[PDB]
Structures are given as structure tokens and as C-alpha cells.
Design a protein around this ligand. Structure first.
Ligand SMILES: [K+]
Ligand SMILES: [K+]
Ligand SMILES: [Mn+2]
Ligand SMILES: [Mn+2]
Lengths: 196, 196
């Protein structure tokens, strides 16, 4: 079974950039629902697979991608943030950013643009393309996970579902994105980059 | 050009079911952005069409469906609500509800279910199918308008984008849906039904 990971920090550790109420709801309510629904759905899938029921397997795909994706995305997201985050990357990672995007600022600009431009609910991602060996920016709708649907290895994710910022920034996504740069855990992003 | 319609009531007229802050933001910020972006996009489309630029026409489709859909959906939504709303329909409409769904309560149940079940942002609709001459429940993702994408004539719409309820009901959509039944303008839904 899958389980809700514990936050590596306190709910209010990202203040004033992301207030405690959002973190608490996001983690204990939203993420929890996905994990629970993921376990229920995998349960039904194992049953459909055992009986070789193809129709059931196919009918179950949206639920599995949605809840499975939700679990994967949020688990990575929590580790992407840190009260000691912010600033800029250093070393091999920063070098790859300059190489693939021109400069750190152009990178920020393109990731911010891809994130603000999502129509409806979704995610903005900085991913690694193993085939080409270069960094790449992508946006995924709803809870569609990056690796599972595009093949890219996720390094940094930005949740742009309205529940991720509405209580604090209302309809102004740009403000939310501007603020989230201050708590990004580049140390974690770097580890994910090195791992591949 | 298209323009932001005025609300037929005060921002706080739907209290306590939908508070004034949501109505104000929803109407003056969210809806306004769609109308503005719709006019800009139609402007570019007329230009692409004049020069017979097919590539430009196709590249512009997401923006036009998203902002155009947003304008259409919200314009109908405002008229679907009323401080004097709630209760049950009467006459031909109520008769068609019983005929097509069994009873008013089964209708409420199915519309509520379709609305709560939207994954990500979307809408729950009670529509009229002209070909078959029966009522039908449908759910549309993001801002995809009902008639334009399914052919059904929209009668009653329920916005389930998180911005429509988060400030007041947080993550609990069921509470939001339970509350919205109290301010539904059945008089307007009936007119839309008669019109076709
Ligand atoms: K797990
Ligand atoms: K108009
Ligand atoms: Mn989220
Ligand atoms: Mn809306």
C-alpha cells in the first residue's frame, strides 16, 4: 500500500511565502484524499487483472492516473520546498540551466510563463530529458504525472491548481509564483538532477 | 465586442450560501479576465482569417475556446442564481425532470454526483437534448462550453472550479453543492427550457 509522507518541516515553516493554512489543507486534506483513493483504485485494478477483465481495467484508468498522479506529484512537491530554500542553484545544476536556457533568469521566466499559462488545473515542471541529455520545461494538466505521461524525469514542480494559492493570493497566480521562488529547495532539485 | 454583464443582484445577495467575497472576485476578476482575453483573441482571429492564415487560426483555438467558453459559462451561471431562488421547479419543467430522471431528488443526486466527480476544473450541467427531446446531465472540463462542444442546450450550470467555493468551503465540494441548491433560480432555468 501507499501512504501519506510526513512533511519534512512544520506547516508554517514557509511563512510568509505560503501560509500555514494552505500547507495544512494541501497536505492533510488534498494529498491524503489522493493516497486513500489510490489504494482503493489499485485494489480494484488487481481484482480486474486477476480475472482478465479488460473492460474493468480500462474503465479504471482515469481514477488511477488522477489519484496516482496526485500522490506522485505532491510527494515530489513537498521535497521541492524548504524554509531554508530560495536563492539560486550552484554547481553542475546551475551550469546546465545556463547551457539549456541561457541564464537562470531566463529559466525563471520560462518556468513562470509555463506555470501561469496552464488553463484550468495543472503543474509546471522543470524536467530532465534522458534521451537528449538536456533540461526541459513542461506543463501537465490536472494530476497527470510528468514521467508517466512524457518520459521526462521530474526535477522541480510547481502546483498551479487554485487550492495551492487561492486563500492567500486569490486569482493572482503571478504573485504566487513570484513568492514560491523564495522557498525552493535547490538542494533537493540538485540531488534529483544528479540521480540521473 | 463582448462585455462583462452586470450582476442582476448585489454581491452579498446570496449569503450565507455563497459569500460576497467569492461573488465579487468571481464576477469582477475571473469573469472580467475572460471577456477581455476573448476580445483580444477574436481580434487576432479576424486578422488570421483575413489573410487566410490556417496555422494562426489553429494555434488560436485553445485561447478562444477557453476565454470564449469562460464568458459563455459564467454569463449563464449568474442568471442561474437568485436570492429568491431555491426550492423546486414547477410546471412543465418539473414534469420533464420526473419523466427523465425519476424524481426531483434523483435529479439532484445525479447532478451533484456529476459535479463532485469532475477531476480538476470544470462544470456540471443540466442540458436539453433537442434531437431526443429529453433532459440530460453532462460535465465539461475547464471552460469548454456545453452547446459548443456537445450540442446540448444549457439550462442550469454549476461551476466546480476551486475558485467558486474554496474561500468558504475549502476542499469540501459536497458542502458547496449542498449549499448552492438554496439559491438556484428555477424561474430562469424554466425560461431556458421553454425557449427550446
Ligand atoms: K509510496
Ligand atoms: K456578449
Ligand atoms: Mn495540489
Ligand atoms: Mn468560475
Amino acid at each position: 500500500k501507499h501512504s501519506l509522507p510526513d512533511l519534512p518541516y512544520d506547516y508554517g515553516a514557509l511563512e510568509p511565502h505560503i501560509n500555514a493554512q494552505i500547507m495544512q489543507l494541501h497536505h492533510s486534506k488534498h494529498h491524503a484524499a489522493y493516497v486513500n483513493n489510490l489504494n482503493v483504485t489499485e485494489e480494484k485494478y488487481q481484482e480486474a487483472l486477476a480475472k482478465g477483465d479488460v473492460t474493468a481495467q480500462i474503465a479504471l484508468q482515469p481514477a488511477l492516473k488522477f489519484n496516482g498522479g496526485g500522490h506522485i506529484n505532491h510527494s515530489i512537491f513537498w521535497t521541492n520546498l524548504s524554509p531554508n530554500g530560495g536563492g539560486e542553484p550552484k554547481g553542475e545544476l546551475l551550469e546546465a540551466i545556463k547551457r539549456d536556457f541561457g541564464s537562470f533568469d531566463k529559466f525563471k521566466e520560462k518556468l513562470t510563463a509555463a506555470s501561469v499559462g496552464v488553463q484550468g488545473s495543472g503543474w509546471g515542471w522543470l524536467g530532465f530529458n534522458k534521451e537528449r541529455g538536456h533540461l526541459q520545461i513542461a506543463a501537465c494538466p490536472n494530476q497527470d504525472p510528468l514521467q508517466g505521461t512524457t518520459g521526462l524525469i521530474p526535477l522541480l514542480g510547481i502546483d498551479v491548481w487554485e487550492h495551492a494559492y487561492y486563500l492567500q493570493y486569490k486569482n493572482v497566480r503571478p504573485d504566487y509564483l513570484k513568492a514560491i521562488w523564495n522557498v525552493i529547495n535547490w538542494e533537493n532539485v540538485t540531488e534529483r538532477y544528479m540521480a540521473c
